[PDB]
Design a protein around this ligand. Sequence first.
Ligand SMILES: [Cu+]
Length: 124
Amino acid sequence: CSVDIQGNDQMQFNTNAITVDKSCKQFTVNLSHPGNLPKNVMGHNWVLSTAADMQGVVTDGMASGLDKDYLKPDDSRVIAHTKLIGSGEKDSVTFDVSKLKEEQYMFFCSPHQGAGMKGTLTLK
Ligand SMILES: [Cu+]
């Protein structure tokens, strides 16, 4: 009921598809950042929304800027998210699987989603 994910200096995650087992009550994402760049140059987060909400979350998040971890404050469309991390840092988020429907979900790094830093998540 957990997955470890890396975001690197090339704006790539090392998975682009997450499967959450139907039997999980909670699911945890452990994000880390190989590389040698600080959070204010190449920072990554991990953000989950419906496929339909992704573009708006990214647009509004990018506009909110670095000091808001590139997320619109209190954004109702964000199902779960980590903080923004730089190289050698790590952050984990846990969420209730009850928040998912057996729907199209996307995960992404908000500042680098437009550069392709995204993938799918499905409750299976
Ligand atoms: Cu990123």
